[PDB]
Design a protein around this ligand. Structure first.
Ligand SMILES: *[C@@H]1O[C@H](CO)[C@@H](O[C@@H]2O[C@H](CO)[C@@H](O[C@@H]3O[C@H](CO)[C@@H](O)[C@H](O)[C@@H]3O)[C@H](O)[C@H]2NC(C)=O)[C@H](O)[C@H]1NC(C)=O
Ligand SMILES: *[C@@H]1O[C@H](CO)[C@@H](O[C@@H]2O[C@H](CO)[C@@H](O)[C@H](O)[C@H]2NC(C)=O)[C@H](O)[C@H]1NC(C)=O
Ligand SMILES: *[C@@H]1O[C@H](CO)[C@@H](O[C@@H]2O[C@H](CO)[C@@H](O)[C@H](O)[C@H]2NC(C)=O)[C@H](O)[C@H]1NC(C)=O
Ligand SMILES: *[C@@H]1O[C@H](CO)[C@@H](O[C@@H]2O[C@H](CO)[C@@H](O)[C@H](O)[C@H]2NC(C)=O)[C@H](O)[C@H]1NC(C)=O
Ligand SMILES: *[C@@H]1O[C@H](CO)[C@@H](O)[C@H](O)[C@H]1NC(C)=O
Ligand SMILES: *[C@@H]1O[C@H](CO)[C@@H](O)[C@H](O)[C@H]1NC(C)=O
Ligand SMILES: *[C@@H]1O[C@H](CO)[C@@H](O)[C@H](O)[C@H]1NC(C)=O
Ligand SMILES: *[C@@H]1O[C@H](CO)[C@@H](O)[C@H](O)[C@H]1NC(C)=O
Ligand SMILES: *[C@@H]1O[C@H](CO)[C@@H](O)[C@H](O)[C@H]1NC(C)=O
Ligand SMILES: *[C@@H]1O[C@H](CO)[C@@H](O)[C@H](O)[C@H]1NC(C)=O
Length: 1319
């Protein structure tokens, strides 16, 4: 017995006018298998195939494509197949799909490699999954995906595949494909999501061929894919697929912002003055920013704040715009961390393992980055950016050893820049960083920079710092390196950053990044790029970042320090600076008198009785600046060194019992040698683990502001502190080693801080003890050189040397003339930067490096920055443009009419005007006395004529004038004049110089156009019953006609007759065809061609033609008959051909074809303007209503019906003025007018035919052309079978007015024909 699995066939046909890639012969067989090896199975089709789409071998089951399949048309169909062994029968389904490939398709196409998945599961049943995962990632429908190639990518033996495909841009606008870079970025971002949804190991993207930079100058290298060859069908068990082989190549394009034959020159976009008077323009690579002034906002600062009103997008992040009653508006921010007046986010905090992802940088040569940060870690990452491969170009900025460092590589070498700031920057206070990168140009021999040089310069600045003086001669000035610079040279000309922007720490990828650190903790704010400030809320990714900075809250609020306590805010807390003799959090303790120590004072306690117990507290209060020395040495037990020093400006605390070192703990996390007051407390605490008792050594610095708890491990406990010493190192109580210097306050000892067991200063140790703490003023000597302000800092000072001076020597920089280009250095009495650079004319800027080349070059205009004129030369405009305004002026000989956007030549008559140039707009020549007309072409006397001497009254016929191009010659009365058709036309134009009105309106019926000369010759033979017409000739004639009819031109009477005859012949032939013999099945655009030709033919400008044309043929009548018969055949064969529903819109024609499910159709409005997204003019907003009972029966094939509706806009007034002669049926009003577009709706039901007369009427909703309401409508239909006019006519029988509002008129009709409302 057998079995078969439902299967599909995919034919990817790359149709071109050059290659007949259509395969022939055997392509495959039914995927039929049977364990029995003796039976001869019978292969027959049951249903589906009706027009022989596929040729089947009944015996072998071989499948062959039929010849009718060769066209540029996608298709889908479902076939039923039966297999029989002679005793049992099974059925199966096969879905056939044909997809067309174009050149625009192969241009926008990308390839993505997959690991461990060869041609065994990607051409079996999982391809659907991929074409979905891709849809979900792209947020698009599965139809937009078009996978056209899947070939074995086993370069050598590796399990890797190679799928190349393309995508359609969502939006409904046909013809748009995703740019390659857009696809690349969109695939790269949601990679893990795709991995999860599609269950596969997606491989990363590899480097491109442009790595070697083979292109020249400022160009751009892009890899592209073109057609190479076609392969036969690859067979599986479920799918027979035909692949198409591409081949790679390169292409160089000029990026914007550059000009020249090699784009070697750059353009400042601010020359166009976009900000206007309400702002100032900042240039940037390929763009500009506005510092647009106060009370003005908007992308072009086109919106006023105080006097404006609500506008879309001004209230960001969902802010509700409320219009103030007196003008202006307010953006109500939603409750959250949003900043007025625009509800933005600027400050963020970063806990461990949290990072954000923004958009990457795309600037090629020059850029600037700046931000502000605050943290405490010695080593941490700040910023990184690179490529997908994590190689070649990359940049990164970090903090190492409390010093900023920038490391970057342009693909060749790594370079580090390290400005030095005294005291570090890891103090928890906010700091700002600025970085600039730019490339020097190749200065040409003529002084013109020809392309970019090989020198790349990076500059780093930290906080307030002068860059020029630093970089040049900071060392010569003294110690001043707050800024730094690095330089690179190499063959590469540009810096490429493919990857996105990250912040706060790299994602924990297995690939190591070229970075010293790996993470970061802390707060940042104001990430400004090129002046523009980025909103923190507008992030692309977020792996744990939380908005705001909680540690920087003003904690002094709501807190009241005690007597003398001054509140200050500190990291995550506050601190009350207490006066002397007061302390304890909020100054809640009294301490004994402080003592001043100068390297010789040491105190000690002994002769004490203490037993090992729990707990114990040792508290001290200190302030100093020494970076070493013993603050407290306590020999617990035998020789248990409790070494509490300030080693290397950090509180170190060793505990070493006996001859062994046991434990230690340091406070390197905080430098405490600042000289400020600090309290510390040793805590000996218990901890019962199981049965044993351990201890714990918690020192709390500043009442637990800091706290470190060394686990006192089993060796350490049981050893209480026996001897206590503070002051330094001493053993013979005479010589002092490492004596302490500074100021210290009272001492706490015992189980609790409240255990005030005063040790009697008078008792114990009294050696070198100086009462008090006051110190002689170091600034009394006043040692800084002049221009100084000495400031005592508690046993230290520093020259706050006067402004305008720099470095340790505090020297004026203006003396060392940093101003460039021989510019004078003038030091104003008050200068924010201390000095100024006075410069001569022709140079502007802070250092006046910039220079203006006025006058600007030819075609270049702008002050003080030149810019292109951008004049439209093709429209007769002079290329030269206003050197101030920038307005383009037309070339001489021309004048631009007010209603026309192109200046046309004046074409004045030399004998009629004193001058020759005609006035602007009006185009009036310098008319001499006696002559009138816009071109001075008419004497006042209808009998006087123009000669060199003026308007002389000639006697004998129209003269020799130039009116209307024709030098219409002398002619008598009654006699016409036939002269050769005007220039560009052939035939014989005739005019009659009538005795009454002179020249009659010329009869151009004979005049034929050059475009129709071949067409006229081709028409002549056709009506002679000679040559015979065929489908291919039909297609070629349709295409030629559409081309000759496109554009705007005065179609002629012989031309309109020819067009009518040709359309009639074509439609008559098309009505005679059936099945695949219809030209419809071979072409896709024939519908568009015919509808466009029809719309062009019915142009209103031919009314004067039409009234003539109308006395010759029926015209619109037989044309409409041809149309309806054609569409009837289309409806009869649509299901056979499987044509997809479609709507065609032209300025005067609407065509809609749609397919409904019979069993589920519940009425609808047609054409589906709800489903129509194209911009619809308000007049065209009519409708046709099918009620829900349309399909419902009046009170397996035949499940789908079709509906086609055609709307003719102006056809009604185009029709001959013919009305029903029966006065009884039609009472003719005084001025009846067809006021509605003609609608032809046709519903076709497969199977049992519906009655010819619609047993259930259809609804139609029209609009009106003119809006006057002075009379009444009648819903009529223009019959064709009616004897009125032979071609039928308007009649009210069977249709009447149901409803009428001020904008719509709804009538009902029981016929599927042409109907309209005679309003
Ligand atoms: C990665 O995948 C996510 C989906 O998991 C993509 O998010 C989608 O992004 C678009 C564009 O921002 C969103 O469309 C817009 O949504 C907003 C809010 O509803 C709406 O106001 C706009 O009119 C528009 O519809 C879309 O909602 C969002 N999510 C979904 C369900 O698709 C994301 O684009 C992908 N790319 C990245 C960032 O890696
Ligand atoms: C395979 O199936 C077809 C379709 O049933 C068979 O065609 C029939 O042939 C017999 C004569 O042998 C006619 O009497 C029938 O009317 C035919 N049926 C149709 C609808 O065509 C064909 O004979 C079968 N072949 C085998 C292998 O038995
Ligand atoms: C986002 O951050 C989290 C941590 O908050 C990351 O999770 C860790 O990732 C590493 C590397 O895979 C693992 O070794 C850890 O076990 C993970 N959790 C812990 C406990 O840190 C996560 O990987 C980051 N981003 C993503 C989604 O990759
Ligand atoms: C970072 O951005 C903020 C934006 O708020 C700046 O704060 C403003 O600074 C200006 C100029 O001093 C003041 O007029 C505003 O009132 C400030 N707004 C407030 C209250 O935040 C801030 O100066 C920028 N710089 C840094 C490094 O913080
Ligand atoms: C492709 O390579 C894989 C390697 O596993 C192999 O199994 C498969 O049969 C190959 N297909 C063709 C047609 O080369
Ligand atoms: C300046 O820097 C040098 C580096 O060797 C250092 O020796 C000197 O003490 C510094 N001077 C000061 C105090 O700024
Ligand atoms: C530019 O236009 C202004 C305003 O019409 C005019 O004053 C100025 O002379 C023009 N400059 C030239 C000569 O193009
Ligand atoms: C062509 O033949 C038809 C049918 O006899 C006739 O009506 C028509 O006038 C003929 N056309 C010419 C002018 O050859
Ligand atoms: C369309 O007609 C014009 C005028 O004869 C001709 O120049 C042009 O090449 C034609 N284009 C096509 C598509 O045939
Ligand atoms: C025809 O006229 C329209 C008017 O909108 C115009 O847009 C179009 O460019 C014209 N085409 C020509 C020049 O034939």
């Amino acid at each position: 017995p057998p079995e078969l699995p439902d299967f599909q066939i995919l034919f990817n046909n790359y149709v071109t006018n050059k290659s007949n890639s259509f395969p022939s012969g055997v392509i495959g067989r039914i995927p039929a298998h049977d364990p029995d090896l003796s039976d001869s199975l019978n292969y027959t089709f049951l249903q589906g195939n009706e027009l022989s789409l596929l040729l089947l071998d009944p015996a072998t089951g071989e499948l062959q494509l039929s010849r009718d399949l060769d066209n540029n048309r996608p298709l889908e169909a479902l076939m039923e197949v039966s297999v029989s062994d002679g005793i049992h029968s099974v059925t199966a389904l096969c879905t056939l799909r044909v997809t067309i490939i174009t050149d625009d398709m192969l241009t926008n196409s990308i390839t993505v490699r997959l690991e461990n998945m060869s041609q065994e599961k990607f051409l079996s049943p999982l391809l659907s999954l991929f074409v979905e995962g891709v849809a979900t990632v792209l947020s698009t429908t599965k139809d937009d995906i078009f996978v056209f190639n899947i070939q074995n990518d086993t370069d050598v033996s590796s399990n890797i595949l190679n799928v190349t495909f393309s995508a359609l841009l969502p939006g409904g606008t046909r013809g748009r494909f995703f740019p390659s870079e857009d696809l690349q970025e969109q695939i790269y971002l949601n990679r893990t999501l795709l991995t999860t949804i599609s269950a596969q190991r997606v491989l990363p993207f590899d480097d491109n061929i442009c790595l070697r930079e083979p292109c020249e100058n400022y160009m751009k290298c892009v890899s592209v894919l073109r057609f190479d060859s076609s392969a036969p069908f690859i067979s599986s068990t479920t799918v027979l697929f035909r692949p198409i082989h591409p081949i790679t190549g390169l292409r160089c394009r000029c990026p914007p912002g550059f000009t020249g034959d090699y784009c070697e020159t750059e353009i400042d976009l601010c020359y166009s003055n976009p900000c206007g008077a309400n702002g100032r323009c900042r240039s940037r690579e390929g763009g500009y920013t506005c510092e647009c002034f106060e009370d003005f906002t908007g992308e072009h600062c086109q919106v006023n704040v105080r006097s404006g009103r609500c506008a879309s997008g001004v209230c960001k992040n969902g802010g509700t715009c409320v219009n103030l009653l007196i003008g202006g508006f307010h953006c109500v921010c939603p409750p959250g961390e949003y900043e007025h007046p625009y509800c933005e986010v600027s400050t963020r905090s970063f806990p461990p393992q949290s990072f954000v992802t923004f958009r990457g940088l795309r600037q090629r040569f020059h850029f600037t980055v700046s931000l502000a940060f605050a943290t405490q870690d010695r080593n941490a990452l700040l910023l990184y950016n690179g490529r997908f491969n994590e190689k070649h170009d990359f940049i990164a900025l970090e903090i190492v050893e409390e010093q900023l460092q920038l490391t970057f590589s342009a693909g060749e070498t790594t370079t580090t820049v390290t400005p030095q700031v005294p005291g570090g920057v890891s103090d928890g206070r906010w700091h700002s960083v600025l970085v600039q990168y730019y490339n020097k140009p190749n200065i040409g021999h003529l002084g013109l920079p020809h392309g970019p040089s090989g020198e790349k310069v990076a500059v780093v600045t930290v906080d307030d710092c002068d860059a020029a003086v630093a970089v040049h001669f900071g060392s010569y000035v003294g110690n001043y390196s707050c800024a730094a610079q690095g330089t690179q040279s190499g063959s590469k000309k540009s810096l490429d950053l493919t990857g996105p922007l990250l912040l706060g720490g790299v994602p924990n990828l297995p690939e190591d990044f070229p970075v010293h650190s790996r993470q970061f903790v802390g707060c940042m704010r104001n990430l400004s790029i090129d002046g523009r400030i980025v909103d923190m809320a507008a992030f692309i990714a977020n792996n744990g970042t939380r908005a705001g900075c909680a540690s920087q809250r003003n904690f002094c609020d709501g807190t009241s320090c005690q007597n003398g306590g001054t509140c200050v805010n500190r990291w995550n807390t506050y601190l009350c600076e207490c006066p002397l003799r007061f302390g304890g959090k909020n100054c809640e303790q009294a301490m004994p008198h402080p003592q001043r120590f100068t390297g010789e004072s040491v105190v000690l306690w002994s002769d004490l009785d203490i037993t090992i117990s729990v707990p114990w507290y040792l508290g001290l209060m200190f302030r100093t600046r020494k970076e070493d020395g013993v603050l407290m040495e306590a020999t617990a037990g035998t020789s248990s060194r409790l070494h509490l020093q300030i080693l290397n400006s950090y509180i170190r605390f060793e505990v070493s019992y006996g001859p062994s070192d046991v434990a230690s703990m340091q406070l390197s996390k905080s430098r405490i040698t600042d000289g400020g007051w600090h309290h510390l407390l040793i805590e000996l605490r218990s901890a019962k683990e199981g049965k044993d008792i351990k201890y714990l050594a918690v020192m709390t610095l500043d009442y637990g502001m800091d706290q470190s708890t060394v686990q006192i491990g089993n060796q350490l406990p049981g050893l209480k502190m026996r001897t206590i010493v503070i002051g330094g190192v001493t053993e013979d109580k005479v010589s002092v080693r490492h004596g302490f210097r500074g100021c210290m306050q009272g001492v706490r000892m015992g189980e609790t801080s409240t255990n005030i067991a005063t040790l009697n200063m008078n008792d114990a140790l009294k050696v070198r003890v100086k009462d008090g703490c006051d110190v002689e003023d170091p600034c009394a000597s006043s040692p800084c050189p002049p221009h100084s302000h000495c400031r005592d800092t508690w046993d230290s000072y520093s020259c706050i040397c006067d402004r305008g001076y720099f470095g340790k020597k505090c020297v004026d920089a203006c003396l060392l003339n940093p101003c460039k280009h021989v510019a004078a250095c003038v030091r104003s009495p008050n200068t924010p930067r201390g000095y100024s650079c006075e410069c001569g004319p022709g140079h502007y800027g802070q250092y006046c490096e910039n220079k203006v080349d006025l006058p600007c070059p030819k075609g270049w205009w702008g002050n003080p920055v030149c810019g292109p004129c951008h004049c439209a030369v093709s429209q007769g405009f002079d290329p030269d443009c206003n050197k101030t305004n920038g307005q383009c002026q037309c070339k001489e000989n021309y004048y631009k009419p007010p209603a026309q956007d192109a200046c046309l030549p004046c074409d004045c008559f030399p004998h009629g005007s004193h001058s020759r140039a005609c006035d602007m707009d009006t185009g009036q020549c310098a008319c001499k006395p006696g002559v009138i007309g816009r071109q001075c072409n008419r004497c006042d006397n209808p009998f006087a004529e123009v000669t060199s001497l003026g308007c002389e009254v000639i006697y004998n016929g129209c003269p020799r004038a130039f009116e209307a191009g024709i030098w219409w010659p002398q002619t008598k009365f009654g006699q016409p004049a036939a002269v050769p058709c005007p220039k560009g036309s052939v035939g014989n134009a005739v005019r009659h110089c009538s005795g009454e009105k002179g020249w009659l309106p010329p009869e151009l019926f004979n005049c034929t156009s050059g475009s129709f000369v071949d067409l006229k010759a081709l028409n002549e033979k056709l009506n002679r019953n000679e040559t015979r017409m065929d489908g291919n000739r039909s297609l070629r004639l349709a295409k030629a006609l559409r081309n000759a009819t496109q554009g705007n031109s005065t179609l002629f009477g012989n031309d309109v007759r020819t067009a009518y005859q040709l359309l009639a012949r074509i439609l008559q032939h098309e009505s005679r065809q059936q099945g695949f013999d219809l030209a419809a099945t071979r072409e896709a655009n024939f519908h568009e061609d015919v509808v466009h030709t029809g719309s062009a033919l019915l142009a209103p400008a031919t009314e004067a033609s039409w009234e003539q044309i109308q006395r010759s043929e029926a015209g619109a009548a037989q044309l409409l008959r041809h149309f309806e018969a054609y569409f009837s055949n289309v409806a009869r064969n649509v299901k056979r051909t499987y044509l997809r529903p479609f709507v065609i819109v032209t300025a005067n024609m609407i065509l809609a074809v749609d397919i409904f499910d019979k069993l589920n159709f519940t009425g609808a409005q047609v054409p589906r303007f709800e489903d129509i997204q194209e911009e619809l003019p308000r007049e065209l907003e009519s409708s046709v209503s099918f009620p829900a009972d349309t399909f419902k029966p009046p009170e397996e094939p035949g499940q789908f019906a079709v509906a086609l509706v055609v709307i003719y806009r102006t056809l009604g007034q185009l029709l001959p003025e013919h009305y029903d002669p029966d006065h009884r049926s039609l009472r003719l009003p005084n001025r009846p007018v067809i006021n509605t577009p003609v609608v032809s709706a046709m519903v076709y039901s497969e199977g049992t035919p519906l009655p010819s007369s619609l047993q259930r009427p259809i609804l139609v909703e029209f609009s009106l052309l003119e809006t006057e309401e002075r009379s009444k409508p009648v819903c009529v239909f223009w019959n064709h079978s009616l004897d009125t006019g032979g071609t039928g006519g308007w009649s009210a029988k069977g249709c009447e007015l149901l409803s009428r509002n001020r904008t719509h008129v709804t009538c009902q009709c029981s016929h599927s024909a042409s109907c309209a409302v005679l309003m």
